């Protein structure tokens, strides 16, 4: 995974520095970002409510 | 909103008949037989009665004397 991240020109540690969209200030201690495969389950609030 | 009733329970330490006296007062207030003794700030009659209790104007004995009067 480290090698593949390097080939893409991304931080090898898999964490990036992120800026707060509201304040614009940087977060201390960079955070893990990346793409994860998420699912929407059949439990829909409009069905539940 | 009145977030704590701690002073009203400090007035009557049972913390249960507090609810009864406040219910009697707020029921005299809703069905318009009586009038509030405190300037309302767009509260409903429950929180009005609690606000009146915490200020020391109303209790069970004041209710009894005013009713017989």
């Amino acid at each position: 995974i480290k090698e593949l991240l390097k080939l893409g020109d991304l931080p090898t540690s898999g964490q990036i520095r992120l800026y707060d969209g509201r304040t614009g200030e940087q977060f201390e201690r960079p955070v893990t970002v990346g793409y994860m495969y998420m699912l929407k389950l059949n439990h829909l609030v409009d069905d539940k409510m | 909103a009145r977030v704590t009733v701690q002073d009203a329970v400090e007035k009557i330490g049972n913390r249960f008949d507090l609810v009864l006296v406040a219910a009697r007062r707020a029921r005299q207030m809703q069905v318009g037989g009586k009038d509030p003794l405190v300037p309302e700030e767009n509260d409903k009659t429950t929180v009005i009665a609690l606000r009146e209790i915490e200020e020391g104007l109303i209790n069970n004995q004041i209710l009894d004397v005013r009713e017989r009067q």
Binding site: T32, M36, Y37, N42 | -
Partner: protein, 228 residues
């Protein structure tokens, strides 16, 4: 999945949701309802061969009221071999299982909007319209034979305003493609007494969508039913 396990193709193919070629050939016609393939001479039967036709299934109701739609993968003139994936089933892409979608996540607490296992999402996700699913409810109106007289499906419905009829045809059934909301009259029915009362089916409260299909099943086999 950007990060899968390789089993996606096995699951998608082995499930019956994809349309898979039985005899390899060349794609002769591609439509969003059917894929017609001219078979290769190798696999071509000598006597009475013809071509292969794959009818696709477009938005139908699954057991759970989800949508079951197949999309074509291939284009005109592409060669296909036996066992390739012609059309994508529900939640499958080019033969692979695509259960959900892969989005850019960041692990951090963001002013306690992801406090517990709850999740924070960017309006861009809704803008790109990527977690919007199509569901499909089925409703049934049944006209039986009572001993006081058979009920009727006519559009003449007691004490309903013409507003409710506007979207109904002369037979009393909604037009395909009409947008409805809770309480609108799906079909017109009269209870015999003869009328003055309506047993007409209405959209359930608080559900609103487009009528995509209507079906009519008649034991009587009446000569003149419009929807039929």
């Amino acid at each position: 999945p950007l990060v899968g396990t390789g089993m996606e193709r096995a699951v998608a193919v082995d499930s019956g949701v994809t349309a898979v070629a039985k005899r390899g050939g060349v794609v002769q016609y591609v439509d969003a309802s059917r894929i017609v393939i001219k078979v290769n001479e190798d696999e071509m039967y000598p006597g009475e061969a013809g071509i292969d036709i794959y009818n696709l299934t477009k938005y139908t109701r699954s057991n759970q009221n989800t949508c079951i739609n197949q999309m074509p993968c291939v284009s005109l003139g592409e060669p296909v071999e036996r066992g390739d994936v012609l059309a994508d089933g529900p939640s499958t892409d080019l033969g692979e299982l695509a259960l959900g979608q892969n989005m850019r996540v960041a692990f951090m607490p963001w002013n306690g909007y992801n406090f517990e296992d709850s999740i924070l999402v960017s309006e861009r996700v809704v803008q790109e319209d990527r977690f919007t699913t199509i569901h499909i409810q089925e409703l049934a109106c049944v006209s039986r034979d009572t001993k006081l007289g058979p009920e009727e499906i006519t559009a003449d419905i007691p004490n309903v305003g013409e507003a409710a009829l506007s979207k109904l045809d002369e037979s009393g059934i909604v037009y395909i493609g009409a947008e409805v909301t809770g309480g609108d009259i799906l079909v017109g029915k009269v209870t015999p007494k003869s009328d003055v009362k309506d047993s007409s089916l209405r959209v359930p409260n608080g559900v609103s969508g487009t009528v995509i299909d209507v079906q009519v099943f008649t034991r009587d086999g009446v000569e003149k039913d419009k929807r039929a």
